[PDB]
């Protein structure tokens, strides 16, 4: 009996409360802030004049701004907006409760026992927060008891969906500001929790035709919708490597153990695409260790994560207990996505992984000076050979990498990002703030990685033989999550050219990676 698997050219996009899914949309407290302060404003702006959004989207320099890219579908958006009104109002109860805690309850205390705060808590937060004083012993603060927030009614799995659609080209349009509706007859929007075993059945494949119908039924699909689901399937078709796959994503194998860092893959089975890409079909059966450096949209892509989930053994992430709006727990987020073996690792702790050893390295900067602990570089020692994936690590704190080198010893290879001009922090995180900063102050708070002198100092402290600049946002499929417009005048490109020369002139190898590349190890 014939067996079928998901086509390689069909993307399954994640959806949370109508929007393309990413980390900060899963915890209810942070969803509530984004809905209230960002998403409702984008929709209401659109429904008051669709032509402004049309005019912005018509221009590539505006891509990544607060614009609905599906501007021709006013009625669908309007109906979607009115049907979900009770979900917005439930969530606004959590929004208001946090506001009340922050503005009306906590600032009334000045160093005395905080027991009376708990007796005054809004119902949405009762039993689900902890309060305490900061370092001055007088200014009250709080954090969330995160798993009780996920157990609350404000975390609602029925608001989660996926949208199936074909992929017809390498480039992807910016997706984070457009409601995720079934805009065309080729697309299918299905109600399903992002952690569902049903999604695993989909991605694992190997199903008979009748099994596919059982699966379609468990998804509540019938009729032409079930036939469309079926049409997304087609008859089903070990020594060392290090492979640069794209942006910050690198694949390795060592003595049979596999590793994938900051995962982002592209698709295949459509004509006209670039050649020699590392796509989903190139993945091995098992990904023993998945490593994530930090919680930025371009390093943890839900769409990629859900598709590879069924192959993954263990996930490694940086450790945080902040349990705040700017820094929700990454491990908790990954477990809500259905990853069941997640390990958090602190500064300079070591963990053995197959035949290799992984060490977490400090990662400072690139987070707009927010109190965010969820970031690290990963050093992997593959026997005698050690590789650092530094992602967007900076050298804003001079001497740290010298101090780190004194503990970790020598490193042979360094992948380092050089996105030296980054977005304003308020663009990514502003909806989470209690109130805005004044505008000129806000402008100084950016999400910058290493420029040339910063990278130079890191490489000099660590003394690798090979240095690759990566994580530059050049691959067209990264357009889902960032603006991908490139020229060799860009300060970032110039600064990477300097770094590459610097390293060449010291006797090492160096290169800014552009597209897939097989490598030493």
Q: Indicate the annotated binding residues for Fe cation.
A: 294, 296, 298-299, 366, 392
Cβ proximity of 289 and 311 under 8 Å: no
Comparing CA positions, the residue from 317, 351, 347, 362 lying closest to residue 335 is 317
- Residue of minimal Cβ distance to K ion: 155
Residues 326-385 contacting a second copy, CB under 8 A? 326, 329, 331-332, 344, 346-349, 362, 364, 367, 369-373
439 contacts a second copy (rule: CB under 8 A)? no
Nearer to a second copy, 331 or 479 (CB): 331
Do the Cβ atoms of 203 and 162 come closer than 8 Å? Answer: no
Out of a second copy, Fe ion, K ion, none, which partner does residue 155 contact, by CB within 5 to 8 A per kind? K ion
φ, ψ (nearest 5 deg) of residue 515: -145, 180
Q: Are 250 and 388 in contact (CB under 8 A)?
A: no
Contact 12/202 with Cβ under 8 angstroms? yes
Distances (CA, A) of 65 to 42, 60, 178: 10, 10, 11
* Residue 171 in tokens: 């480039």
Breaks (C-N over 2.5 A) in the chain follow: 237
* Contact status: 437 vs a second copy (CB under 8 A): yes
Piece in contact with a second copy (CB under 8 A), picked from 40-48, 107-115, 226-234, 249-257: 107-115
Nearer Cβ to a second copy (165/375): 375
Cα–Cα distance for residue pair 313/309, rounded to 1 Å: 9
Cβ closer to K ion: 155 or 174? 155
Contact by Cβ (8 Å): 380, 433: no
- CB of 103 vs K ion, minimal distance in Å: 26
CA-nearest of 270, 267, 249 to 307 is 267
CA distance 377 to 389: 6
Return binding residues: 294, 296, 298-299, 366, 392
User: Among 148-156, 315-323, 369-377, 388-396, which window interacts with K ion (CB under 5 A)?
Assistant: 148-156
Contact (Cβ atoms closer than 8 angstroms) between residue 515 and residue 277: yes
Cα–Cα distances in angstroms (integers) from residue 368 to residues 151, 263, 426, 436, in the given order: 31, 23, 8, 14
- Contact characters 83-102, a second copy, x per CB under 8 A: -------------------x
Closer residue to a second copy in complex, CB, 79/151 = 151
Task: Examine residue 159 and tell whether it contacts K ion (CB under 5 A).
Answer: no
Q: Which of residues 111-130 bind a second copy (CB under 8 A)?
A: 111-115, 118-119, 121, 126-130
Among residues 497, 472, 419, the alpha carbon closest in space to that of 244 is found at 472
Instruction: Give the pair of three-digit tokens for residue 126.
Output: 């009762």
Of 104-112, 196-204, 270-278, 464-472: span binding a second copy (CB under 8 A): 104-112
What single string gives the DSSP state of each residue in 317-331? EE-----SSSS--HH
DSSP state at residue 273:
P
Interface with Fe ion (CB under 5 A), residue total 3
CB nearer K ion, residue 155 or residue 452: 155
138 binds, among K ion, a second copy, Fe ion, none (CB under 5 to 8 A by kind): a second copy
Q: Which of 13, 262, 327, 392 binds Fe ion (CB under 5 A)?
A: 392
Nearest-5° Cα angle at 327, 323 to 328: 55
Looking only at residues 382 through 411 of this chain, which bind a second copy when binding is defined by CB under 8 A?
396-404, 406-407
Q: Which stretch binds Fe ion (CB under 5 A): 157-165, 200-208, 385-393, 505-513?
A: 385-393
Residues composing the chain: 521
Nearest distance, CB of residue 16 and K ion, angstroms = 14
**Candidate residues 34, 155, 164, 174; the one interacting with K ion per rule CB under 5 A:** 155
CB of 384 to Fe ion, least distance (A): 30
- Where does residue 440 fall: left (phi above 0), alpha (psi -120 to 50 degrees), or beta otherwise? alpha
**212/471 with CB nearer Fe ion:** 471
Q: In the complex with a second copy, which residue's Cβ is closer, 374 or 496?
A: 374
Residues contacting residue 183 through CB under 8 Å, at least 6 positions apart: 70, 73, 76
**Strand 207-208 to strand 140-144: parallel, antiparallel, or no bridges (unpaired)?**
unpaired
Q: Which is nearer to a second copy, 62 or 405 (CB)?
A: 405
| The binder of Fe ion chosen from 296, 373, 381, 516 (CB under 5 A) | 296
* The binder of a second copy chosen from 55, 151, 171, 281 (CB under 8 A): 151
| Binding flag, residue 444, a second copy (CB under 8 A) | yes
Whether the CB-CB separation of 488 and 451 falls below 8 Å is answered with no
> According to CB under 8 A, which residues from 181 to 240 bind a second copy?
none
Question: Can residue 322 be called a binding residue for a second copy (CB under 8 A)?
Answer: yes
- Tell me the window of 153-161, 236-244, 269-277, 385-393 that interacts with K ion (CB under 5 A): 153-161
72/120 with CB nearer a second copy? 120
Q: Are 240 and 36 in contact (CB under 8 A)?
A: no
Residues in the site for Fe ion, rule: CB under 5 A? Answer: 296, 298, 392
Residues in the site for K ion, rule: CB under 5 A? Answer: 155
């Amino acid at each position: 009996h014939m067996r079928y698997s998901l086509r390689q050219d069909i993307a399954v996009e994640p959806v949370i409360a109508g929007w393309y899914g990413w980390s900060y949309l899963l915890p209810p407290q942070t969803l509530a802030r984004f809905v209230h302060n960002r998403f409702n404003r984008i929709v209401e702006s659109y429904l008051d004049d669709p032509q402004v959004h049309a005019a912005a989207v018509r221009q590539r320099r505006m891509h990544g701004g607060p614009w609905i890219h599906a501007h021709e579908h006013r009625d669908a958006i309007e109906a979607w907006y009115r049907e979900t009104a009770p979900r917005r109002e439930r969530l606004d109860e959590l929004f208001e409760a946090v506001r009340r805690l922050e503005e009306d309850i906590l600032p009334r205390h000045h160093g005395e026992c905080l027991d009376p705060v708990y007796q005054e808590l809004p119902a949405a937060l009762a039993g689900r927060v902890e309060v305490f004083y900061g370092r001055d012993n007088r200014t009250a603060d709080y954090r969330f008891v995160e798993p009780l927030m996920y157990a609350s009614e404000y975390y609602d799995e029925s608001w989660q969906q996926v949208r199936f659609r074909p992929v017809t080209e390498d480039a992807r349009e910016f997706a984070l500001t457009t409601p995720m509706l079934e805009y065309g007859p080729e697309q299918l929007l299905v109600n399903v929790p992002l952690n569902s075993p049903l999604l695993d059945a989909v991605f694992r494949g190997g199903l008979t035709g009748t099994e596919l119908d059982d699966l379609a039924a468990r998804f509540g699909l019938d009729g032409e919708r079930a036939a469309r689901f079926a049409s997304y399937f087609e008859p089903t078709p070990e020594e060392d490597v290090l492979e640069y796959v794209g942006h910050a994503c690198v694949f390795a194998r060592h003595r049979g153990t596999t590793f994938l860092v900051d995962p982002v893959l592209s698709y295949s089975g459509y004509p006209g695409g670039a050649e020699n890409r590392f796509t989903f079909a190139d993945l091995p059966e098992r990904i023993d260790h998945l490593l994530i450096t930090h919680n930025h949209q371009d390093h943890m892509l839900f769409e990629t994560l859900l598709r590879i989930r069924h192959r993954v053994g263990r996930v490694l992430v940086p450790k945080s207990t902040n349990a705040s709006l700017v820094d929700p727990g990454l491990g908790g987020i990954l477990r809500r996505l259905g990853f069941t073996d997640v390990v958090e690792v602190d500064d300079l702790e070591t963990l053995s992984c197959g035949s290799a050893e992984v060490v977490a390295l400090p990662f400072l900067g690139e987070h707009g000076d927010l109190r965010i602990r969820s970031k690290t570089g990963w050093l992997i020692r593959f026997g005698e050979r050690s590789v650092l994936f530094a992602a967007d690590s900076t050298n804003i704190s001079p001497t740290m990498y010298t101090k780190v080198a004194e503990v970790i010893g020598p490193v042979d290879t360094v992948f380092i990002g050089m996105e030296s001009i980054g977005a304003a922090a308020s663009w990514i995180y502003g909806p989470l703030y209690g109130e805005p900063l004044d505008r000129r102050t806000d402008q100084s708070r950016r999400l910058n990685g290493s420029n040339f002198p910063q990278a130079r100092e890191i490489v000099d402290a660590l003394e690798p033989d090979e240095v690759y600049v990566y994580a530059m946002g050049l691959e067209p499929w990264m357009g889902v999550v960032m603006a991908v417009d490139y020229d060799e005048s860009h300060p970032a490109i110039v600064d990477s050219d300097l770094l590459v020369r610097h390293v060449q002139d010291k006797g090492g190898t160096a290169e800014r990676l552009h597209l897939r590349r097989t490598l030493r190890l």
